[PDB]
Design a protein around this ligand. Structure first.
Ligand SMILES: [Mg+2]
Ligand SMILES: [Mg+2]
Ligand SMILES: [Mg+2]
Ligand SMILES: [Mg+2]
Ligand SMILES: [Mg+2]
Ligand SMILES: [Mg+2]
Ligand SMILES: [Mg+2]
Ligand SMILES: [Mg+2]
Ligand SMILES: [Mg+2]
Ligand SMILES: [Mg+2]
Ligand SMILES: [Mg+2]
Ligand SMILES: [Mg+2]
Ligand SMILES: [Mg+2]
Ligand SMILES: [Mg+2]
Ligand SMILES: [Mg+2]
Ligand SMILES: [Mg+2]
Ligand SMILES: [Mg+2]
Ligand SMILES: [Mg+2]
Ligand SMILES: [Mg+2]
Ligand SMILES: [Zn+2]
Lengths: 157, 141, 112, 67, 100, 53, 145, 100, 143
RNA sequence: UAAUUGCGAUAACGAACGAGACCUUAACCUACUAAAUAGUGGUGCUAGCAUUUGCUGGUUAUCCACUUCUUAGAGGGACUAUCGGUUUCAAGCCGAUGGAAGUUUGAGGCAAUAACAGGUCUGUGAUGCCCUUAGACGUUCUGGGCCGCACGCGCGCUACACUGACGGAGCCAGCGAGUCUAACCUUGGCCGAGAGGUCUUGGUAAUCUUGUGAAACUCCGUCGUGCUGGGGAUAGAGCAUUGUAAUUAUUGCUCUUCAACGAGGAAUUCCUAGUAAGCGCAAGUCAUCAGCUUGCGUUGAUUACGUCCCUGCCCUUUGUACACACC
RNA sequence: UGGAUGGAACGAAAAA
């Protein structure tokens, strides 16, 4: 019994919270988005990831964990909420996937130029049509600066 | 049934529908005679469609209008546009177009907006100023 | 305008529209000055006036004439306008418009 | 201005080059067949292309044209 | 940074108020138009409101020494008997002309 | 004690905060979403708000 | 459409309540010159005095001037609805008054000295000669004297 | 029997798909229906400063959300009633079914 | 040929009906008349002060003859005006309520209007007898 | 040409981004699909005036019919179309006709390479380093300050009156917002001069507020060139509302008090059509408080359709003792 | 078959 205006914006923040939570949770599992589908008697959630078996966990321990977390914090009755995890197609064609891989490679000490050209090469090999990676900050110096690595060609406007 | 047409006139944001049917020659504006078009200056301005062609072309027909929206000046131009378009529509679909040719030419030759709506539309207001073009004020020092 | 036309009719029984068009014809400055030069030293130089500007200037000088005269005065703007119009139409040297008209003419000729 | 950009000029050049025993001096019919024999993403572009194509065949009717 | 004396001095100088005027403010005639009428006025109205191509509230106050209200009430009185005809009776502007 | 949080917070700026950064300044309460503007712009696309004109 | 000539009984500027009211203006607005008497009060009192508002002040019958004055000095006795009066619940006798020409400044001064004597914030502010209603003074009221 | 079905989606394409197949199902079942009434869409606007902090040129930025709402009336037996709301569920479109 | 209120000029009809109500003088008088402002937005009481209640009744009477149902809220909205908030910019203020309320009660007691279902006042059977006959007299006054 | 936008010329050929292209919005559709949460006509019941048929209203389950006005979805429509001038004779330009629309139709959204040692650690559970960490620079509670005033400056709001003020009447918009573990937006009735109070009602919304009966505006009056019935700063007295709590008055209402201002010096801001300017309304902050901002509509001008003189910008040539680059 | 010269205009702390 809510006005449709607030109902829709509530759905907006609904999608927002889950998306931000998952990006903070399933980083090491190659999370690449989420989709929400509302039906009578059930609201359904689809995860887009790469390491799907890791998202599920042993006997689905992890996926059941996430189902409980979202249940308890969103005030849902049992059976009204379900999560599936599904492998993303064209893992190279996913900016959120790439940025996360870049993050992990840097955290493991990999060099800037080698990491970035690793990514742009991977995405080019994966059948893309234009890519660009920009890195900014302290790079082996005190004065900060950026470097651009790009292949193919893109659009801006 | 009886012969009848219905048209509309428009202005900035004012609209005026016009019911025209064969009758005894009465002109009404939302339940009142044409002679009570409140502005006491545009009186002739709404008389124009009647006077340009002559009152005789009204002895056999009835015109009634309903006008809403806009302001008084825009409203008047709505009534006059509605009357003119209803008139030509009636002459189009019941009378022969012989009369049409003279009445249309006389109308356009005297004023365009009798039959063609004015295309001037308001421009949106933009930040950094009080109007579409104006800015607030720059003070360098 | 309706009022000032009535005024121009009760006085000066000729057609008021003819009166005003005469006033316009008689109040259009036919020569004027402007800045002319080729650099750091440009000067007031005389120049002829387009007919369209002649009319536009006339209409201005008349309307400002009325507005200033009727300002802070018992006389209404409607009758003050007609006073200006009929004076300029006949040619009086008492209307404001003629003051500026011949003042511009005299300055232009002295600075030809 | 009314300048026609190269993506229009080149496309029209293509149509004239390979579709002469075809679309004629009428803008309406050329419009109605441009989408039939070519793929254009937007109608405004399609209309511009057809307009220039007509302008070209108007040139064609008075001698040849360079290129 | 100004010294902790210069600013004080400036403030003192500033408190030289009276307000710059940049104006002239020349006086005027200060008219004293009559407010209540009398016999020697009344007959004056009666004898010279004719021979006027135009009369109005302003016309009878710039020449005569009567006020606006006296003018309007006079025009209302005069036209009742009929000396000057009405041709436009809008408010804020009355237009009347001599009968002939 | 019973005075640690005694003061009422039934209204005013302190009664509410951004649901992300928990700031008190610059809230957007319109449509009852309660997010400060600068956090809002980041999540605008995810929420579904877009620029058209 | 009526123009009555006159009678020689007209008088120019006259005096009452220690105030030299102008003549030859309408009575309701002439009374506005009375210190402490405004537009609304003058209008109401003249209607309670049954005087037609249209006559100029100088052209007026003397025998009802004192009737008007009697009205305004104790208005509450003449079905004045008691919320017109400018001094209500005052400070000592608790009844309803309406101060007039010479009394207005006296009641202002003694109120100010009352607040001074009691050392209230408002009285202190009045003594210092500043604003009391809580306005900003950073950029306004510069050349106040 | 005199049922109201309302659609309150955000995306036009999927909204139209839902409206299309509902009316198609009703037509193929040969039911008397009141055509899809297309209520005017509502636009949700927010205007904020672009800059996080306070300096710079005063630039303003506005976002929108378009909500499209539609409604339909049916006269339908109970057996079909349940299966319309049983089918034609696809995401981004909120559906509301009610009697009276 | 048949006439109605909408066949006569708005100003004249009101002036006619108010002058009508004058000589019977039986409508009503609140008693607190010629003391009030008719609105917080006004600055001076009515200059007439010899009535203007009959004018108020005439206007509200034809206004109800115009619309279907009207209440005090709409009367305040209609009769309000732009108040001059001193130095701050002007602003709309709806007119006083007790005035129009007592006017409506007066028209009730005369039987020109009555309480209508789903809120407001409707013009009465014998009420429109009066309004139309006044309009007829007003129009034939030109002869 | 608005455009390294094009015609072309050519030790260059072939390409990419930006512009353009693109998307949204405002204008045309008596053509398609329809619509008691939009209308219209007719038919019933019914009110008034004339009667001779008629005119103007009211009326939900009286039905019937339609989609012009309103709403959208899919589409169409302008591409400078046709004609006449003008140029290697090309890209183009000008005028006229037709047309809802002929300055890329109007307005925006997005918007390249390289930079600034521009702003923000007070938006962030983003942060490196430094400091502090329990009589803490953590957190919380009470009371003050952010407004404080001898002065200087910036954005604005009121006005210096008659193209006006005041009082009665007349009577017209658009963009929007609205309550669930709640008190929102309020119609209607009653009390009160007013602010406001009280009893009910509809709405989670094209249906209810709301036709937002707005204001400026018109029509009759009073005033009358008088710092005046202009102007409402300052101040006194009383009545309410919001909020635990208003005292250096939150705001509203009533009465009284009635100051500068007579068109504003050097200087300086914005602007080419529904635009400037006048006029209000909705939303943001919000327990209460607009002189602010973001949008919306009503009334609607004058003066260009040009130039590089002032202030600057783009391209080419040339000089340079400059390179944190004329500061 | 052409044609205009044309007023005044000082300075900017050290290092990167
Ligand atoms: Mg404007
Ligand atoms: Mg005047
Ligand atoms: Mg009014
Ligand atoms: Mg103003
Ligand atoms: Mg009926
Ligand atoms: Mg040609
Ligand atoms: Mg554009
Ligand atoms: Mg930051
Ligand atoms: Mg501050
Ligand atoms: Mg600013
Ligand atoms: Mg409306
Ligand atoms: Mg005043
Ligand atoms: Mg607000
Ligand atoms: Mg602010
Ligand atoms: Mg040299
Ligand atoms: Mg060097
Ligand atoms: Mg130097
Ligand atoms: Mg030196
Ligand atoms: Mg030196
Ligand atoms: Zn935040």
């Amino acid at each position: 019994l809510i006005s449709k205006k607030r109902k829709l914006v509530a759905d907006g923040v609904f999608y927002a919270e889950l998306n931000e939570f998952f990006t903070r949770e399933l980083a090491e599992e190659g999370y690449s988005g989420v989709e929400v589908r509302v039906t009578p008697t059930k609201t359904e959630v689809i995860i887009r990831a790469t390491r799907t078996q890791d998202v599920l966990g042993e006997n689905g321990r992890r996926i059941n964990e996430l189902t409980l977390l979202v249940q308890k914090r969103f005030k849902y009755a049992p059976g009204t909420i379900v999560l599936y995890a599904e492998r993303v197609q064209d893992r190279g064609l996913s900016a959120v996937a790439q940025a996360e891989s870049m993050k992990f490679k840097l955290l493991n000490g990999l060099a800037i130029r080698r990491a970035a050209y690793g990514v742009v090469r991977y995405v080019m090999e994966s059948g893309a049509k234009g890519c660009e990676v920009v890195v900014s900050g302290k790079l082996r110096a005190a004065r900060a600066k950026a470097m651009k690595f790009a292949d193919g060609f893109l659009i801006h406007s | 049934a009886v012969p009848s047409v219905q048209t509309f006139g428009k202005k900035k944001s004012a609209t005026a529908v016009a019911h025209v049917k064969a009758g005894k020659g009465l002109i009404k504006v939302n339940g009142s005679p044409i002679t009570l078009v409140e502005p006491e200056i545009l009186r002739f301005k709404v008389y124009e469609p009647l006077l340009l062609v002559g009152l005789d072309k009204f002895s056999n027909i009835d015109i009634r209008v309903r006008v809403t929206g806009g302001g008084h000046v825009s409203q008047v131009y709505a009534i006059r546009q509605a009357i003119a378009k209803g008139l030509v529509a009636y002459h189009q679909k019941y009378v022969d177009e012989q009369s049409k040719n003279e009445l249309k030419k006389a109308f356009t030759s005297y004023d365009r907006t009798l039959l063609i709506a004015d295309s001037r539309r308001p421009e949106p207001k933009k930040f950094g100023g009080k109007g579409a073009r104006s800015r607030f004020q720059k003070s360098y020092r | 305008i309706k009022h000032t036309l009535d005024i121009i009719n009760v006085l000066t029984d000729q057609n008021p529209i003819q009166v005003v068009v005469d006033a316009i014809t008689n109040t259009g400055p036919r020569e004027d000055t402007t800045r002319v030069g080729g650099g750091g030293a440009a000067r007031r130089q005389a120049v002829d006036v387009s007919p369209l500007r002649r009319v536009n200037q006339a209409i201005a000088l008349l309307t400002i004439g009325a507005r200033e005269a009727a300002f802070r005065n018992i006389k209404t703007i409607a009758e003050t306008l007609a006073e200006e119009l009929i004076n300029a139409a006949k040619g009086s040297s008492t209307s404001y418009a003629i003051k500026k008209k011949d003042e511009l003419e005299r300055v232009a000729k002295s600075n030809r | 201005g009314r300048v026609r950009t190269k993506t229009v000029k080149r496309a029209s050049k293509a149509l004239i080059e390979r579709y002469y025993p075809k679309l004629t001096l009428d803008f309406q019919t050329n419009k109605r067949l441009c989408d039939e024999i070519a793929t254009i993403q937007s109608k405004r572009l399609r209309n511009k292309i057809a307009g220039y194509t007509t302008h070209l065949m108007k040139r064609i009717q008075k001698g040849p044209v360079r290129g | 940074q100004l010294s902790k004396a210069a600013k004080a001095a400036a403030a003192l100088a500033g408190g030289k108020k009276s307000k710059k005027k940049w104006s002239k403010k020349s006086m005027k005639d200060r008219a004293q138009h009559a407010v209540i009428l009398d016999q020697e006025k009344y007959d004056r109205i009666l004898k010279e409101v004719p021979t006027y191509r135009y009369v109005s509230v302003s016309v009878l106050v710039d020449r005569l020494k009567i006020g606006g209200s006296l003018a309007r009430i006079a025009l209302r009185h005069l036209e009742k008997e009929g000396i000057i005809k009405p041709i436009s009776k809008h408010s804020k502007q009355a237009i009347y002309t001599r009968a002939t | 004690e019973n005075v640690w949080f005694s003061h009422p917070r039934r209204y005013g700026k302190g009664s509410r905060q951004c649901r992300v950064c928990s700031s008190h300044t610059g809230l957007i309460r319109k449509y009852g979403l309660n997010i400060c503007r600068q956090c809002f712009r980041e999540k605008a696309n995810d929420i579904g708000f877009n620029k058209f004109r | 459409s009526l123009v009555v000539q006159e009678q020689g009984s007209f008088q120019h500027i006259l005096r009452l309540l220690n105030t030299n009211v102008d003549g030859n203006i309408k009575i309701v607005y002439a009374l506005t010159t009375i210190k402490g008497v405004g537009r609304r009060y003058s209008n109401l009192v003249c209607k309670k005095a049954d005087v037609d508002l249209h006559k100029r002040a100088g052209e007026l019958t003397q025998e009802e001037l004192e009737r008007i004055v009697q009205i305004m000095q104790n208005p509450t006795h003449y079905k004045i609805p008691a919320w017109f009066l400018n001094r209500q619940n005052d400070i000592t006798d608790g009844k309803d008054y309406h101060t007039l020409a010479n009394n207005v400044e006296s009641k202002l001064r003694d109120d100010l000295e009352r607040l001074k004597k009691i050392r209230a914030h408002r009285g202190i502010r009045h003594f210092w000669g500043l604003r009391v209603r809580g306005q900003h003074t950073k950029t306004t009221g510069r050349r106040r004297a | 029997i005199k049922i109201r079905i309302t659609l309150t989606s955000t995306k036009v394409k999927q909204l139209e798909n839902v409206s299309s197949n509902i009316v198609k199902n009703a037509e193929q079942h040969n039911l008397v229906k009141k055509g899809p009434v297309r209520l005017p869409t509502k636009v949700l606007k927010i205007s904020t400063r672009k800059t996080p902090n306070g300096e710079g040129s005063k630039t303003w930025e506005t976002y929108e959300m378009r909500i499209h709402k539609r409604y339909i009336d049916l006269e339908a037996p109970v057996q079909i009633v349940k299966r319309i709301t049983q089918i034609t569920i696809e995401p981004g479109v909120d559906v509301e079914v009610v009697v009276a | 040929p048949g006439v109605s209120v909408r066949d006569v000029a708005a100003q004249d009809f009101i002036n006619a009906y108010a002058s009508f109500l004058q000589r019977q003088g039986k409508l009503e008088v609140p008693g607190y008349v010629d003391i009030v402002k008719t609105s917080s937005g006004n600055e001076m009481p009515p200059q007439d002060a010899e009535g203007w209640f009959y004018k108020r009744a005439a206007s509200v009477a034809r206004h109800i003859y115009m619309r279907k149902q009207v209440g005090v809220g709409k009367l305040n909205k209609l009769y309000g005006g732009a108040k001059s908030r001193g130095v701050r910019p002007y602003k709309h203020i709806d007119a006083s309520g007790s005035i129009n309320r007592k006017v409506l009660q007066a028209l009730e007691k005369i039987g020109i209007v009555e309480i209508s279902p789903k809120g407001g006042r409707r013009i009465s059977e014998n009420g429109q007898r009066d309004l139309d006959r006044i309009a007829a007299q007003t129009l034939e006054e030109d002869e």
